[PDB]
Write an enzyme that holds these catalytic residues in place. Structure first.
Site, PDB file in Angstrom:
ATOM      1  N   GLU A   1       1.352  -1.160  -0.152  1.00 41.81           N
ATOM      2  CA  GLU A   1      -0.304   0.270  -0.467  1.00 41.81           C
ATOM      3  C   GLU A   1       0.959   1.485  -0.005  1.00 41.81           C
ATOM      4  OE1 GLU A   1      -2.578   0.943   3.166  1.00 41.81           O
ATOM      5  OE2 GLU A   1      -3.923   2.161   2.503  1.00 41.81           O
TER       6      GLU A   1
ATOM      7  N   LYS B   1     -10.299  -0.202  -1.349  1.00 41.92           N
ATOM      8  CA  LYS B   1     -10.055  -0.444   0.825  1.00 41.92           C
ATOM      9  C   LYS B   1     -11.636   0.000   0.991  1.00 41.92           C
ATOM     10  CE  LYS B   1      -7.202   0.485   3.759  1.00 41.92           C
ATOM     11  NZ  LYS B   1      -5.804   1.694   4.227  1.00 41.92           N
TER      12      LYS B   1
ATOM     13  N   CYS C   1      -4.619  -3.240   3.983  1.00 39.41           N
ATOM     14  CA  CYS C   1      -4.030  -2.852   5.108  1.00 39.41           C
ATOM     15  C   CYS C   1      -5.066  -2.964   6.462  1.00 39.41           C
ATOM     16  CB  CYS C   1      -3.267  -1.619   5.514  1.00 39.41           C
ATOM     17  SG  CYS C   1      -2.465  -1.890   6.094  1.00 39.41           S
TER      18      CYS C   1
END
Lengths: 322, 322, 322, 322, 322, 322
Positions: free
Chosen positions: E48, E121, E154
């Site tokens: 990321e 995301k 993440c």
């Protein structure tokens, strides 16, 4: 032999003198409860910031500062006298010089209620801390079971020359009290071990459990043997009392008897087999420079953080935060 | 970045100059083989005693001592020039002063075959080692990939002031070559980490695999990052090549940029937020004593080992063991 | 020194001689690939059951049994000759005595394609395994780089007397090939270390990656030094090749040179300092009993498992499972 | 179930019978203090050399030797009777044969003050120790909570055949008392685990804290379960009392009930599924040789350390060191 | 099987589109170099923020945002086609809806240079991240060696329901690309294992080495097997390539074959032995609430952080930070 | 704060109601002994199967089944009332519907002797267990020191959605009682940590010591903090009491105060910085499917174990095992 206890003390948010007052009584109660729980304990150690907490918006104000000695120290003294223990306390101390910032201070009180050691943080944790650099050097005192005690405060433990200074003046049990050593955690554990091994002394270290009314699992308690081995590593729990037996005379006998391991002697006596007495000149330009007050790193003229302006402090000097 | 290799070199028993020339050819063969196996390698490091071994009955004899420079270092220079690498070698060095014992010496040779660093062990391992205490201080040279290299020898790595000195002179990659650092294995690993962290530099360290024709699993290779974390810890195998990528500029940048972690700066500029520039006087009695050549521990009086008498060495000075 | 490879071989479900020939070709392909990937390798080791798998419903049938030697071992011999390596293979072997169950057999083939070692599992894993107890004792052969090789099979490695026997016959590298040593994983690792240390020899050990068409992470590869230290512990991956450099002469030298650590010598020469030669009588009733074929534990009377009845096997002897 | 305690006893320098006398009283005081601290303790174990210390210059003299039984054992017996515990003691025993060197001896006393086990070190730690090889085999006795106890001394624990012998005679709790097992530390921990697993018994082992008036952190305390798992590993501290609950009947039930794990049965009953009763002949030439008193390693004729001349002992025989 | 590589990519400080194009070329060079160094590699994964860095003062500006697809992803596509690998890249994506903040986006490009997976995301890291919550659900694509790949970003990996969703759609290799997952390091490692085990799939996860021009040892690479075991844990080094062999079909077979361990099946078929098919109603109020868009924790009322106000972000919606 | 105790209870073989009766009294005695040993304990937790044992041949019979509440629960209630503790008990419960298999049931009794929570295993451990799927959802109750307690049974802990459900209904201390979690051991420890971290709650978990009259070292005791850190991991010992202090309000304050770590809030409020309130639709097809009772994995039509026929259970339905 003697039993030491390090207290992973949890400090609540402190907004007033009244909060500080309640906190003092909490510390006192913890002290007596520890001696009741561990009847053989002779030394009880509280962490950095455990008296006044960590209120970075108020910690430079007169309301948040104490005198050493003062009425608050006398309450700690009374408790040590009643419990018949040595106690170690953290106090943010109003500077007797009103033109200077306050000190970050540590005291050792004996079972008679006398302050037998007073230490001012020599290396404030910059650029965050506003405390004035300590002016009392690295003092050493007599403790229980043949110990010679010295205290450093938190970031002070990152400086090996300071551990060396304690040892050089006789310290055989080096105490480190910390406010928040988490996130520099590995290095705290590391230097507690190295401070011990380098100097053939015990280290006993503690970190504050927490300060923010939410998280109280930042506490640490670590006892290292004079070979650098960790004898006791506490679990992290609020109110955890980390204990262990210390044999100060064993450290002394190692210093007296050892050859190959005697690095503290070797420092001032390099190569004594080939040259009687050793070479007394260590090598070592930084030592001569620092003794002369002209320690200067080759890269200093390109460094970025050299004052507290990154956190909102004046770069001028004098007293501030009143 | 540059790739480094530390060689867990096994030395046979050395009973003659014939055996020493054999070690020299073995080291040179190893050097070429390492470059062949690791084409990117720029720095190859051999342990203490890898040239002459550890024959305590012969190690002070003329047969067992070499000149630095001499025909032997010229062979090592030829190999480094041919391989186009930096090499670190151990030489027990004949003292040009005939009234003094030999030195325990390390050299760094560059890819041009020039000796760019010469260091004599400042802290011989006493009471067992008869080497004269070094007189060349702690030098630093230019290395590959932006490095400033310095080397200490074995027991030297136990002295935190010496790692500081290397750093103070610019070192960002601190090399420790070792000969029998087993039995103090935990303390060796420990100080390799603390030497790195204290000073915001890499440490690269190696121990001899063995020396006695029997046991060759004493080898160590350890690379520590400038935060004190062990990046690489070799297995214990004779001939093991411990490699790692080093980034000297990242250490430089930490030293330039860091505030809270910048202990090396803090040492000479204590509490710079409340006092501009900080206090240049660190504390601190041992520093002043050592600088003046008068470092004295309070217990020196009652110490048992202050000469080599336990090992049979004369106690009166001068050249011996010839 | 020589480089060894232990293969964490995954065997599919085996339902036919077709599947067995498939395993044989897979093992041979793996052997060549290992030599291609590790040009210095001299000894390649395959696990127990890697030829025929673990079909407990078919493993005693004629279809699932091979001769040693036979056309299959000749294929393995061809591969070792072509690759110029020593190879260790597992074969469930038809018993030439038709009144007896097959053996669980291991062979070592040299770089000339000769079977230089043949071993039949002395300690079948009971009550689950129906293999006839081996009758070829514990043989030792010449291997690469000065080694004296011996092989045991899986459960065999739990018997410390058997590692002793291998050593007593000269073994300095003891190979353990295993088929399902998970669920006893801790005890497998443990005895691989103790077998090494007890006898001052290397151990090299491997477990099958899997056998059931689903789970292939049961593999192990472990190399222990003659002091009992694990030098290499493989990851658990199917097809993982665990490699390490072995120095058989260093083990030989330990056995020749060591005093305090020389337990294998001490066994038959107890206390040789006060009694010259030592006492040749070790103690020691079980040794005498076992030698005479009369080893009997005091509690055999009340034991629950003394035959294969729990697994459905007949209890009266002879050939079964055909 | 029963509670065991192993004492990491620190022994001071012993120069006379009077020092030995004070040491006995120290052991006795420790015994009572342990029972007071741990009211449920039934077995208390003292380390090797804890009665007479380690004075290698005086330990063969008549002043330094005791009889078993004798007035000193009766004092130990009285203490065991008063405290109502089993106790294990180390005594360097004057040989009843004045033409032989003394024994290194261990005794178990019951809560009645009767010596119920006497063991003479079968494998003295050569070439350093002068003790005559033990002549009482490996005895076993009844202990607390259904235990059958046996003791070995230090280096004895390195011999797996000795652990097997204890088990073979019924032992389910195998005690190892050690004098200085540090520097063979990994291998001590290793064999304490293997001795347990191999034989399906508990092991309880202790090492002396120290002996030299300086360093007292050599102590060890280890309890292993009958699967080889370490249940308790003490920290190293002078005076540390390492405790744990032992369930001897659980070891017995494992021996009675288990199949796959029952290696002690398998040794004398190889392959019992295929061959009723198992094969009673183990394999195993060393076993036959040692039973016949002709254990001979293939490399014996080239071994270096075969008598005590490396430490200054006569290679002739008889009594010496008076 | 296929070999995967996760790149511990170090991103410099990014102050311009010039710096972003520099990162793009650096990533492409790294991609080719990885394929050159690991010829068998089929899947290469970048962390990321590896394209645009972490400049929180510029990261919402048009200069710092890219289109997906756009000329930049076309360059990444060209590299994957040339290298014949699958590649995973991080792009902060301009939202085509001008009233909404940009997305934090990941793509997977196949060896043909086609974007075969695009993911936004779903769980921006709040309150610090200003990214619009993703609207493409949790997609799965075809990967190498029989894999069904899915990627999360993440903080996404902290949500066990999201790993379940990937699995429910077929995923057998779950990729987590991360940008600053230090300070939550333990919880990152933990959930990488739990995400794998819960769902019987592999996890492959990577963290950025650093982002601030100083410290580049924040990198992580972790590969977990479908049983939750960590197969590979990389060292922390900038530019470190963490590789491992993955066997997607073995995960498929576990899901097909396993009974006791088949938790993913059990979720929707509770207790199928006593009730055929199982109970299809799991429990279970939050599932029903969340499905209906009405998930509400009982304590939401008293929560302190429910918007980005602590970080200075507006609280009223719409596009900001331009 | 409050003290919890998890009991590694050893259950003997249970052949009759009379065995069950004695077992109940054993549990009761253990309860009182624990409160006597730990006077501050407020919650005492017994493992799965600890009332009726594990007799898989008899555990479906009427003799082996109890009612909840019933005379046996009242005995547990009386004991909790006398000892003034909360207690957690495992009961195999006769189904009030005689046409359905019994439940695997857990109860929490308060210091008043009232059952305040009753939980039926929602996910029986298939294909081995015959228990009917629980129909009481995941209940939560008030416990000591500001806790909200919930219990799951063993394999239930493998399902993250169940831990989420407990948290969603207020649970801040999630209890897991297990019967035999060994051989799925790593994954049990793993999910105890993940269940805690995912939901910001404590987990307290226990496994039964053993059940077979032979081996009683299968016990486990684990307390995890709300960050997923293991605070206490017990040693495995029969009768081991694993204890620790829990601060339920600290979990609550983390849920109230935290931002970056607040994953439980983020689940229903994705991206709240960019979109006021967050996106309330999670993503997430499995969630919608399971709420609708149509959870279906893509590979279901090729799965092997979907009923209890592999262990000898009817695949028809209804009541059986009478």
């Amino acid at each position: 032999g003697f039993l030491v206890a390090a207290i992973q003390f949890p400090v609540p948010i402190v907004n007033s003198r009244k909060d500080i007052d309640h906190n003092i009584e909490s510390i006192i109660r913890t002290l007596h409860a520890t001696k009741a729980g561990y009847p053989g304990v002779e030394l009880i150690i509280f962490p950095e910031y455990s008296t006044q907490g960590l209120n970075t918006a108020k910690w430079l104000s007169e309301e948040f500062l104490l005198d050493v000695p003062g009425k608050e120290t006398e309450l700690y003294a009374k408790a040590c006298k009643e419990a018949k223990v040595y106690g170690v306390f953290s106090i943010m101390e109003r500077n007797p010089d009103s033109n200077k910032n306050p000190y970050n201070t540590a005291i050792i009180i004996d079972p008679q209620g006398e302050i037998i050691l007073k230490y001012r943080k020599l290396f404030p944790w910059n650029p965050i801390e506003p405390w004035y650099p300590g002016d009392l050097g690295m003092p050493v005192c007599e403790g229980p079971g043949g110990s010679k005690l010295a205290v450093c405060i938190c970031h002070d433990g990152m400086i090996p020359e300071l551990a060396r200074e304690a040892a050089y003046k006789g310290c055989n049990v080096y105490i480190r009290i910390s406010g928040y050593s988490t996130q520099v955690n590995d290095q705290w554990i590391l230097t507690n071990r190295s401070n011990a091994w380098h100097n053939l002394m015990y280290t006993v270290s503690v970190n504050l459990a927490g300060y923010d009314n939410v998280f109280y699992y930042f506490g640490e308690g670590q006892i290292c043997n004079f070979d650098g081995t960790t004898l006791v590593q506490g679990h992290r729990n609020p109110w955890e009392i980390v204990t262990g037996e210390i044999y100060p005379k064993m450290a002394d006998n190692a210093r007296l008897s050892w050859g190959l391991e005697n690095n503290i002697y070797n420092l001032g006596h390099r190569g004594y087999v080939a040259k009687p007495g050793g070479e007394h000149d260590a090598g070592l330009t930084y030592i001569k420079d620092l003794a002369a007050g002209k320690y200067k790193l080759p890269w200093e003229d390109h460094m970025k953080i050299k004052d507290g302006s990154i956190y909102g402090y004046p770069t001028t000097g004098g007293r501030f935060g009143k």
